[PDB]
């Protein structure tokens, strides 16, 4: 009481899977080789012993292969054995193969048209061996069969996996943040962002982690200023939120710290032999062509060529303190004509970025980000931020690492 389906497996796999799953859904015992995870002896036993119908799929590749031809041959021998004219039901599905050029062994049989509207062909099959007395519908069986073999090859497994992120932790902060009472030594119309060290104008004070005498070369009036006027604030209480006073709130102090981090890292790239390009909200920092050995750091490419243009991997940094003291570097691709001069038009840059990121995936993105960050690093496992003459911000070379108990088998 089995319905044997013979076909060319690679060409007709999709059709055979669909038809077999449907037929199992309606409640018909179905035998196909792609429904089972020697074998040919089992095929012979099923064909000769307890199959009722023998469906043969008749694509342009389902009539020239030896295996399908010989299962059709044993099928016709069994057909002559049972003395039942209703054994071999062709299923023509290919438009390129007409009702000619079809094998002698199957040319005389009344085929079922799957050329258009597979649903009509399935309905013809159903009302064919419904009144042909071929032996309850249970679609749960079809769902199970779909899960066991078509699905089990790839699924979620209880496998431990480890992940690199965008988040690079801040190893250590300068202990004390200093506000300087710079009434007249600091001009009111002067921009504090161009100061040799990062500086914010907060409450007429000059927010910085730097000492009161760093701002001397371009701010010479600041000398002979009393250090008692400066207010020094424990950075640990800022990070933990313990410091919340009427003078300054914890969240706005943390905002000043984040501004300090971003500005200091900006000046660090200013001295890091790395070029900058303007995005909408941040700056992207990338290496020019020829500034790395064989266009590589370690063994990871950061600058390359495509279709007469050049791409440079670039990073845009911005710190945050909510989960922990840690910045989040962002990965960009910056395009050029000759590798040293930028393309002014932004639409061409966008199109080139979408072209290049098409073939980039997890491994390439992670390797390029890690290579860039380890390239800018001075310390072996840390990067320096010049926020003070004696104070610095330490950024971990290795980003925040994560691990999960569930993962997948990598297909490659």
């Amino acid at each position: 009481n089995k319905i044997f389906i013979s076909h060319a497996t690679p060409e007709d796999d999709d059709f055979t899977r669909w038809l077999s799953l449907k037929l199992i859904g309606l409640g018909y015992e179905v035998w196909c080789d792609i429904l089972f995870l020697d074998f040919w002896s089992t095929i012979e036993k099923e064909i000769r012993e307890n199959t009722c119908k023998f469906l043969i799929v008749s694509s342009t590749a389902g009539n020239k292969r030896e295996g399908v031809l010989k299962e059709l041959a044993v099928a016709t021998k069994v057909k002559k054995h049972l003395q039942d004219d209703m054994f071999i039901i062709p299923l023509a599905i290919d438009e390129n193969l007409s009702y000619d050029d079809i094998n002698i062994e199957i040319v005389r049989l009344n085929a079922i048209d799957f050329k258009k509207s597979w649903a009509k062909g399935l309905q013809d099959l159903l009302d064919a061996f419904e009144k042909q007395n071929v032996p309850p519908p249970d679609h749960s069986k079809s769902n199970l069969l779909y899960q066991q073999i078509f699905l089990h090859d790839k699924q979620a497994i209880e496998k431990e996996e480890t992940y690199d992120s965008n988040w690079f932790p801040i190893i250590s902060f300068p202990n004390e943040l200093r506000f300087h009472r710079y009434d007249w030594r600091l001009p009111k119309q002067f921009d504090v962002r161009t100061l040799a060290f990062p500086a914010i104008r907060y409450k007429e004070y000059l927010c910085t982690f730097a000492w009161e005498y760093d701002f001397i070369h371009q701010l010479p009036k600041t000398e002979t200023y009393n250090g008692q006027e400066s207010i020094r604030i424990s950075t640990s209480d800022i990070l933990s939120g313990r410091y919340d006073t009427d003078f300054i709130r914890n969240y706005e102090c943390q905002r000043l710290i984040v501004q300090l981090i971003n500005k200091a890292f900006e000046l660090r790239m200013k001295d890091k032999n790395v070029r900058e390009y303007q995005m909408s909200k941040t700056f992207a920092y990338w290496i020019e062509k020829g500034k790395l050995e064989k266009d590589k750091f370690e063994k990871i490419k950061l600058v390359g060529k495509q279709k007469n243009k050049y791409w440079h991997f670039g990073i845009s940094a911005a710190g945050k303190l909510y989960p922990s003291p840690v910045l989040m570097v962002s990965s960009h691709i910056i395009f050029t004509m000759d590798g040293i001069n930028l393309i002014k038009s932004k639409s061409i840059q966008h199109s080139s970025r979408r072209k290049q990121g098409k073939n980039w995936w997890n491994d390439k993105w992670r390797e390029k980000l890690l290579a860039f960050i380890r390239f800018l690093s001075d310390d072996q496992n840390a990067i320096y931020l010049n926020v003070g003459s004696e104070e610095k911000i330490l950024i971990s070379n290795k980003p925040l690492k994560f691990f999960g108990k569930m993962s997948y088998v990598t297909p490659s």
């Binding site: 999709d14 059709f15 679609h139 108990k405």
Partner: protein, 131 residues
């Protein structure tokens, strides 16, 4: 080494109470929940637009292949999946032949006059916008 939790994939129901994660595979395997009998397709657009829609609706009937059939499943064919008839020979056609407002008004009033005056019922109007 922060813990990354896993949330189990939620299963979307299909016909006959069979739950599958992928809407495409669940639709091809079991089908939609409710059985609408067919789509009385109505098309407003140019004659070239009508021809394009009719050709594509002819192509929909036959199964069509992605370039990568495992990463993205095949389309068995509209009647194979949904169990309802949407042929292209049963189309209610409305021929057409500040700019945004009047351009929208053309298709709009075509659709409203067809839904108001015309006897033939349309279940969904396929506005074939030219390019």
């Amino acid at each position: 080494m922060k813990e990354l939790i896993y949330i189990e994939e939620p299963s979307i129901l299909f016909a006959h109470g069979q739950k599958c994660t992928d809407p495409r595979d669940g639709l091809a395997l079991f089908g939609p929940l409710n059985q609408i009998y067919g789509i009385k397709s109505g098309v407003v657009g140019t004659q070239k637009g009508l021809q394009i829609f009719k050709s594509y609706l002819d192509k929909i009937q036959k199964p069509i292949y992605n370039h990568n059939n495992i990463t993205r499943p095949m389309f068995p064919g509209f009647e194979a999946v949904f169990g309802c008839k949407w042929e292209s020979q049963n189309i209610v056609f409305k021929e057409i032949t500040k700019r945004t407002y009047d351009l929208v008004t053309l298709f709009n009033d075509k659709i409203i006059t067809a839904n108001k005056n015309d006897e033939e019922r349309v279940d969904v109007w396929f506005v074939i916008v030219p390019e």
